[PDB]
Amino acid sequence: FPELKNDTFLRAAWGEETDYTPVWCMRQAGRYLPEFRETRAAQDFFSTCRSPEACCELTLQPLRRFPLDAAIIFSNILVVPQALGMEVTMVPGKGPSFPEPLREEQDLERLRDPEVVASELGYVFQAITLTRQRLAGRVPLIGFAGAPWTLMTYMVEGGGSSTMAQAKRWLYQRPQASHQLLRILTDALVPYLVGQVVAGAQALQLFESHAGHLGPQLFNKFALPYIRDVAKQVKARLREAGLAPVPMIIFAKDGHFALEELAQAGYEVVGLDWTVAPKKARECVGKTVTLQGNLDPCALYASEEEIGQLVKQMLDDFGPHRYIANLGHGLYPDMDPEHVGAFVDAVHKHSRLLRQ
Amino acid sequence: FPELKNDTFLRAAWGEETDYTPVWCMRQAGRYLPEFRETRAAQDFFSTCRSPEACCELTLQPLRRFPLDAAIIFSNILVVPQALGMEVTMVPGKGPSFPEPLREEQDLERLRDPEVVASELGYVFQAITLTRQRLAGRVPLIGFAGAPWTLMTYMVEGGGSSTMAQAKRWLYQRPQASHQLLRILTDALVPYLVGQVVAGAQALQLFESHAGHLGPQLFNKFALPYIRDVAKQVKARLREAGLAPVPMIIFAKDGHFALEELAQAGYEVVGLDWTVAPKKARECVGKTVTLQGNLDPCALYASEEEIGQLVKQMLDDFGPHRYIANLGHGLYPDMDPEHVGAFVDAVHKHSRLLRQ
């Protein structure tokens, strides 16, 4: 592949000093972009995900607008449960649904062997290779997947939930079957993630988007071991294959309570939601790991000038070292692209000012 | 297996009142679907049939597009003569062929004992189990086979024919050897069909696709006894095994002349081609059996609006009771998936309107 030209994101991820703070945005390819909506209007959601050219195009769109320091492949975390044999749908204005969720132990019988999932996700790898070629070394390309617990929640609940009451009911009433599911997920995720790197991904982010529904005791029992296993095994497989392991980011949304644990889980970067004060996060994770985040996405509803000030304060709190800027969650569909531009420009401006 | 969620097709099959008319389409997994062609391009035809994952995938494809009230396993009726020891080929753009057809009585010597056929058709049962698991109770899964006479026609003619002149020449010149063949077929079909149910099929359709070449006298002598024997014996074997017998559908294409007989042949459902006026069919079969059918498949070449009107008229003629909607034959390769969607939506809409 083309030689990387701007590697600032990777250097920060590994914890090296840089001349400025690199920045990207979760959902930078999203509906807040008119061109995103135009491109998506052609196919249905999971059809778009299966088209390497469409994913590559949506990936590149944000970078034509903003000098972001990383791209993330366009895809969805639900491609994994789909490749395990569950049927998904993207309900008109209503979001993802599995009309036949896993509700009892016996339901695990309809899943594929996790060892075959990577072969079912060829299309993601083709999107990854194409996008890495087309980016031509501009910035690094991030691959990603959902974390086991979070993927379990979608598979059991059948969609989103404000309580995760069914998935937590599995944890308390069906602990063994929960462990079996989580192990299936882990064993699918590892080869999928490795394959993303083989195909060209230069970093990886694991989204534990549903961490916050758990307290510490359940998280430590049911989410953390598999988060740790994913990192250990991805790195091992890559080493064995002759490849360079890439930086890995763990993002546990609403995970204030697990930050200490997550800093010892084998990830170079811990991502933060906007509810955790940067200084408290730094005290929790210590001085080696890199932090990523964490501006309230809704802050981008403020004026460009206000965004600038919010960004300056955020950057003062994180300090110049061991830090990659991002929002605290993905961009929302009603947000103004110019405000996203203001965020990006302000990270770049103040982080330089903060260095001299 | 997962508990069935939508059983409307089964209730209608048994002749119970439902809130709407359930609908499916013969060849719903077929070349009219671009994704069907993509999946099939990987292997050759009979290789596809031997892959449980490929059959399961082609089975599910139509249901991702349309809310059909039943799935039918992807397979072919010729797997039976192949398992009896005949060699088949799917000739490039030319259809099925047996390059060494049965032409004289002595040729029966190369067939397997019919009692061993089920063991040769393991692959179909594996496809059936997998598909039933993966459907997760969404709708019922229909298994199927060719009827004895129709299978005989392929074995003697070596393919399709506009006259069935060789196979009919066996009926008139070789009646005893014809009966022997038809009995072989029946004795293979029974354990095969039972095994389909054991593996997960929730209904069964017997395709007498070549009925119309016969008049009443030949049909009553050579086709009907074996059609009746298949039902009697399948039900007996299932009962004996501790299982629930499933609804059975007999579809004699071009069989206007046998409808009275077929209504007393032990099948819950009689399927109709598009040449029989629904009201005349109802008069022939009487008031217990369920009718299935019968829209001209070529009607789907009309506009969506016209399909809607044709469907409304069809539904007025059948009435709300003892009726499962389908076409009068399988979908053709040049048909438009959106028109198939229109058919499905219109059965659902007008059948509800017809109830209140």
Side-chain angles (χ1 to χ4, degrees):
Chain A
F1 293 111
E3 173 150 316
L4 195 55
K5 293 172 58 163
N6 173 2
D7 72 343
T8 304
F9 168 80
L10 298 174
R11 289 186 331 102
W14 289 114
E16 301 166 24
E17 203 84 34
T18 54
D19 294 335
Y20 68 92
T21 286
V23 60
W24 69 286
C25 301
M26 281 171 283
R27 288 196 244 123
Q28 52 187 226
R31 294 194 46 81
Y32 75 103
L33 292 180
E35 61 267 39
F36 177 102
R37 288 185 237 116
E38 165 125 82
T39 43
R40 282 270 308 94
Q43 323 115 332
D44 65 280
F45 183 77
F46 286 101
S47 155
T48 295
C49 290
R50 284 158 179 285
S51 166
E53 287 281 358
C55 294
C56 176
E57 168 72 13
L58 298 168
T59 303
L60 295 181
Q61 282 172 1
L63 300 190
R64 300 183 188 133
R65 278 196 193 239
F66 325 109
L68 294 146
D69 299 289
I72 180 162
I73 190 59
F74 183 80
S75 199
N76 187 272
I77 59 173
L78 296 179
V79 300
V80 170
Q82 187 181 69
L84 283 161
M86 294 188 75
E87 294 287 311
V88 200
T89 80
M90 204 52 47
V91 182
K94 266 81 203 174
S97 190
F98 297 84
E100 299 91 28
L102 307 176
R103 284 306 166 65
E104 57 197 57
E105 183 180 344
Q106 179 185 72
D107 292 341
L108 301 179
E109 287 179 346
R110 49 170 203 283
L111 305 180
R112 288 193 169 95
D113 189 315
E115 285 181 358
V116 314
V117 166
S119 66
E120 293 298 320
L121 295 171
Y123 66 93
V124 180
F125 300 152
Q126 286 179 299
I128 286 173
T129 299
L130 179 61
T131 302
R132 172 97 180 251
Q133 285 288 8
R134 288 274 179 79
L135 266 172
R138 184 181 302 169
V139 286
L141 175 60
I142 306 166
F144 77 95
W149 157 244
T150 282
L151 291 183
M152 171 171 171
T153 65
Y154 281 103
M155 295 167 82
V156 171
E157 298 288 339
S161 170
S162 75
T163 63
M164 298 307 157
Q166 296 292 331
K168 292 174 61 178
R169 176 165 208 154
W170 271 57
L171 301 186
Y172 282 116
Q173 294 192 345
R174 297 181 197 269
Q176 305 169 60
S178 301
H179 284 307
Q180 189 185 347
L181 180 50
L182 294 161
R183 179 59 65 206
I184 290 165
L185 283 160
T186 297
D187 289 346
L189 279 165
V190 166
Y192 173 44
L193 291 171
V194 169
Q196 286 190 51
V197 170
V198 172
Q202 291 154 299
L204 295 174
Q205 181 152 316
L206 200 77
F207 285 89
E208 192 72 285
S209 300
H210 288 186
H213 294 274
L214 305 178
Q217 288 167 91
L218 280 185
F219 187 90
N220 293 348
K221 268 182 201 223
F222 289 101
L224 184 69
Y226 306 101
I227 283 161
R228 291 168 55 88
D229 289 352
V230 166
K232 188 188 177 159
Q233 291 186 46
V234 167
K235 288 173 181 195
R237 298 217 191 183
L238 287 171
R239 286 194 275 77
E240 287 161 40
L243 304 167
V246 301
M248 298 184 74
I249 303 149
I250 184 52
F251 176 45
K253 185 190 182 272
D254 289 319
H256 57 67
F257 61 84
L259 293 178
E260 181 162 2
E261 289 72 20
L262 293 167
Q264 295 301 321
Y267 292 78
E268 283 65 38
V269 183
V270 173
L272 300 176
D273 66 68
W274 68 94
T275 77
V276 178
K279 296 193 206 162
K280 294 187 187 179
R282 190 76 75 183
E283 301 174 297
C284 293
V285 301
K287 252 191 127 56
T288 121
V289 305
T290 283
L291 292 174
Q292 174 171 272
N294 71 333
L295 184 78
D296 183 14
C298 295
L300 303 186
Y301 296 133
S303 71
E304 299 192 11
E305 166 183 75
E306 294 158 342
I307 292 172
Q309 300 155 182
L310 290 176
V311 163
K312 163 176 188 304
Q313 183 62 56
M314 185 171 68
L315 268 55
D316 286 338
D317 290 5
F318 281 106
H321 308 297
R322 286 162 272 116
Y323 180 48
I324 297 160
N326 205 312
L327 304 179
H329 203 16
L331 288 158
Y332 298 175
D334 63 341
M335 288 183 178
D336 180 341
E338 301 301 311
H339 284 132
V340 176
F343 174 62
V344 169
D345 292 343
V347 173
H348 287 159
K349 170 181 178 203
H350 172 95
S351 65
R352 289 175 169 292
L353 291 177
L354 177 57
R355 276 152 178 80
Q356 181 266 302
Chain B
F1 293 111
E3 173 150 316
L4 195 55
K5 293 172 58 163
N6 173 2
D7 72 343
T8 304
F9 168 80
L10 298 174
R11 289 186 331 102
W14 289 114
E16 301 166 24
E17 203 84 34
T18 54
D19 294 335
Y20 68 92
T21 286
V23 60
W24 69 286
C25 301
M26 281 171 283
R27 288 196 244 123
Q28 52 187 226
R31 294 194 46 81
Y32 75 103
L33 292 180
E35 61 267 39
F36 177 102
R37 288 185 237 116
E38 165 125 82
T39 43
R40 282 270 308 94
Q43 323 115 332
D44 65 280
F45 183 77
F46 286 102
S47 155
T48 295
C49 290
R50 284 158 179 285
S51 166
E53 287 281 358
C55 294
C56 176
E57 168 72 13
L58 298 168
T59 303
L60 295 181
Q61 282 172 1
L63 300 190
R64 300 183 188 133
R65 278 196 193 239
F66 325 109
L68 294 146
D69 299 289
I72 180 162
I73 190 59
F74 183 80
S75 199
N76 187 272
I77 59 173
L78 296 179
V79 300
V80 170
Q82 187 181 69
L84 283 161
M86 294 188 75
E87 294 287 311
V88 200
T89 80
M90 204 52 47
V91 182
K94 266 81 203 174
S97 190
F98 297 84
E100 299 91 28
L102 307 176
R103 284 306 166 65
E104 57 197 57
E105 183 180 344
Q106 179 185 72
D107 292 341
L108 301 179
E109 287 179 346
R110 49 170 203 283
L111 305 180
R112 288 193 169 95
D113 189 315
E115 285 181 358
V116 314
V117 166
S119 66
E120 293 298 320
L121 295 171
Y123 66 93
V124 180
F125 300 152
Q126 286 179 299
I128 286 173
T129 299
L130 179 61
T131 302
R132 172 97 180 251
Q133 285 288 8
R134 288 274 179 79
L135 266 172
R138 184 181 302 169
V139 286
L141 175 60
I142 306 166
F144 77 95
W149 157 244
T150 282
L151 291 183
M152 171 171 171
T153 65
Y154 281 103
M155 295 167 82
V156 171
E157 298 288 339
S161 170
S162 75
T163 63
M164 298 307 157
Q166 296 292 331
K168 292 174 61 178
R169 176 165 208 154
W170 271 57
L171 301 186
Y172 282 116
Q173 294 192 345
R174 297 181 197 269
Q176 305 169 60
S178 301
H179 284 307
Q180 189 185 347
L181 180 50
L182 294 161
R183 179 59 65 206
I184 290 165
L185 283 160
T186 297
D187 289 346
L189 279 165
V190 166
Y192 173 44
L193 291 171
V194 169
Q196 286 190 51
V197 170
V198 172
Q202 291 154 299
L204 295 174
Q205 181 152 316
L206 200 77
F207 285 89
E208 192 72 285
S209 300
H210 288 186
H213 294 274
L214 305 178
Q217 288 167 91
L218 280 185
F219 187 90
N220 293 348
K221 268 182 201 223
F222 289 101
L224 184 69
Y226 306 101
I227 283 161
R228 291 168 55 88
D229 289 352
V230 166
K232 188 188 177 159
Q233 291 186 46
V234 167
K235 288 173 181 195
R237 298 217 191 183
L238 287 171
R239 286 194 275 77
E240 287 161 40
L243 304 167
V246 301
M248 298 184 74
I249 303 149
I250 184 52
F251 176 45
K253 185 190 182 272
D254 289 319
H256 57 67
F257 61 84
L259 293 178
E260 181 162 2
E261 289 72 20
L262 293 168
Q264 295 301 321
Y267 292 78
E268 283 65 38
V269 183
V270 173
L272 300 176
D273 66 68
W274 68 94
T275 77
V276 178
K279 296 193 206 162
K280 294 187 187 179
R282 190 76 75 183
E283 301 174 297
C284 293
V285 301
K287 252 191 127 56
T288 121
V289 305
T290 283
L291 292 174
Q292 174 171 272
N294 71 333
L295 184 78
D296 183 14
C298 295
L300 303 186
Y301 296 133
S303 71
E304 299 192 11
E305 166 183 75
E306 294 158 342
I307 292 172
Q309 300 155 182
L310 290 176
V311 163
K312 163 176 188 304
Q313 183 62 56
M314 185 171 68
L315 268 55
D316 286 338
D317 290 5
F318 281 106
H321 308 297
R322 286 162 272 116
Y323 180 48
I324 297 160
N326 205 312
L327 304 179
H329 203 16
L331 288 158
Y332 298 175
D334 63 341
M335 288 183 178
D336 180 341
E338 301 301 311
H339 284 132
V340 176
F343 174 62
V344 169
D345 292 343
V347 173
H348 287 159
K349 170 181 178 203
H350 172 95
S351 65
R352 289 175 169 292
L353 291 177
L354 177 57
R355 276 152 178 80
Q356 181 266 302

